[PDB]
Ligand SMILES: CC(=O)O[C@@H]1[C@@H](C)O[C@@H](c2ccc3c(c2O)[C@H](O)[C@]24O[C@@]2(C3=O)[C@@]2(O)C(=O)C=C(C)C[C@@]2(O)C[C@@H]4O)C[C@H]1OC(=O)/C=C/C=C/C=C/C=C/C(=O)O
Ligand SMILES: CC(=O)O[C@@H]1[C@@H](C)O[C@@H](c2ccc3c(c2O)[C@H](O)[C@]24O[C@@]2(C3=O)[C@@]2(O)C(=O)C=C(C)C[C@@]2(O)C[C@@H]4O)C[C@H]1OC(=O)/C=C/C=C/C=C/C=C/C(=O)O
Ligand SMILES: [Ca+2]
């Protein structure tokens with residue numbers, strides 16, 4: 001039976017060096033550029049000798065994820081103020097993804113990453129609502145609202161940065177250039193919800209940081225409303 | 233760069249050595265079939281041309297870049313969703329229908345979970361029509377546009393995360409031969425070592441008390457979706473007191 005990288009003890013070179021060097025490549029070149037042969041060259045080592053520490057590309061990615069999650073700066077305990085605690089975790093996750101853009105898209109597996117940094121972060125996040133009388137699956141559903149918002153926002157933010165390096169058209173410029181088509185769509189009268197969105201939305205005109213915070217505040221109100229009903 | 237939705241499409245044309253007339257639609261449809269069977273990376277201009285019995289360069293007359301092709305493919309398959317013109321007066325039932333149609337679509341075309349790496353939205357006609365339906369489900373409540381979009385954000389965040397993870401398991405298992413249920417079996421001993429450490433009590437509680445993972449995929453999706461709809465409902469109430 002193939003053994004989890006987390007159950008697979010590691011014996012000049014080390015697993016951590018290999019992982020950190022891989023991360024440094026992916027940060028600027030993407031995860032596909034962080035091949036073993038590339039990471040080997042970065043460490044002045046022979047490629048075959050890397051496999052002794054990290055048996056596969058798949059395992060390298062999983063190690064890379066857990067390694068970076070270790071960079072977040074969370075207190076030991078979430079404390080009683082769940083809003084502040086989730087805001088703190090939200091801001092840290094956003095900053096982490098923007099430092100490591102590949103996090104938004106590198107993971108195409110189903111299985112979760114059960115390395116020590118991810119488990120430690122999960123304690124903090126799951127613990128934020130431990131002071132309400134929730135069943136586990138109620139808890140996990142509310143935390144899914146939180147993760148859903150943060151990851152969707154930042155995945156899109158990192159999509160725009162990626163897209164703009166290809167096209168040199170960023171979000172603001174994209175909205176400017178799409179205006180004549182948007183008007184054509186509104187004037188057709190076929191998309192009245194869309195027309196309402198365009199006429200009335202505020203979010204796209206704020207900077208990214210206040211747009212993130214303003215969505216977070218609404219997200220947290222949505223969790224608070226559910227808490228009112230579940231644990232009254 | 234003119235967007236693909238504004239890029240005027242030339243007349244259908246048959247190259248002298250080809251049996252079939254070439255059009256944008258026929259190229260996108262042939263691309264979708266390739267992506268379904270072999271993934272989006274395999275659907276190079278050449279491969280898609282081979283499926284059509286056409287020369288590679290003649291495709292570029294109809295679709296100028298791979299990215300436009302992908303945007304076209306995304307909009308094409310979204311046309312497959314089966315939604316009525318208007319959502320109707322039951323918002324839970326309407327978002328339930330859209331959730332189940334999106335999940336089935338992503339299961340038919342699993343590259344939808346991963347192939348879109350851009351920031352810009354797809355404003356093709358199939359996407360805009362589905363967006364009207366989805367946005368329309370809460371349009372009758374007294375909601376500011378950005379409260380509406382935050383609530384629809386909850387809906388999409390749930391459906392996409394679930395199905396992205398579902399399709400991930402399927403892809404992962406084609407490589408490893410271990411699906412989710414088997415992965416849970418094989419990970420038992422390690423999970424028990426983590427619990428035994430005493431360093432992860434929330435994790436221990438989760439492993440002890442979670443029900444969802446033990447359900448079959450349809451029941452798990454439904455049961456999460458009901459909980460998501462309960463949260464949207466608590467928000468709808470609280471947004472318009474008393
Ligand atoms: C995320 C995203 O899609 O973000 C979009 C951004 C890139 O682009 C934003 C965008 C684009 C263009 C404009 C605007 C945008 O905000 C402006 O607001 C704008 O509307 C503009 C304008 O071009 C205007 O200038 C103009 O040129 C023409 C018109 C007719 C109106 C204006 O005159 C007035 C206003 O200036 C809107 C925003 O749309 C939304 O927020 C859409 C949200 C839709 C949620 C869909 C969920 C559906 C779920 C599902 O199917 O499961
Ligand atoms: C999505 C996912 O991660 O899905 C996981 C699935 C693949 O795997 C599920 C999983 C795995 C293993 C087992 C189980 C699982 O459910 C079982 O429930 C299990 O717990 C099992 C067992 O192996 C057991 O058999 C066993 O071998 C060992 C122990 C200690 C207990 C059992 O004896 C009893 C029980 O049968 C857990 C589930 O965890 C969750 O559902 C976790 C939700 C995590 C949310 C974290 C939010 C973090 C956010 C953030 O940091 O921003
Ligand atoms: Ca508030």
Ligand SMILES: [Cl-]
Nearest residue numbers: 030031032102
């Ligand atoms: Cl990447």
Ligand SMILES: [Cl-]
Nearest residue numbers: 035036037057
């Ligand atoms: Cl490699």
Ligand SMILES: [Cl-]
Nearest residue numbers: 055056057058
């Ligand atoms: Cl490998």
Ligand SMILES: [Cl-]
Nearest residue numbers: 160161170171
């Ligand atoms: Cl941008």
Ligand SMILES: [Cl-]
Nearest residue numbers: 207208209210
């Ligand atoms: Cl800002």
Ligand SMILES: [Cl-]
Nearest residue numbers: 271272273343
């Ligand atoms: Cl793919």
Ligand SMILES: [Cl-]
Nearest residue numbers: 401402411412
């Ligand atoms: Cl599975």
Ligand SMILES: [Cl-]
Nearest residue numbers: 448449450451
């Ligand atoms: Cl089922």
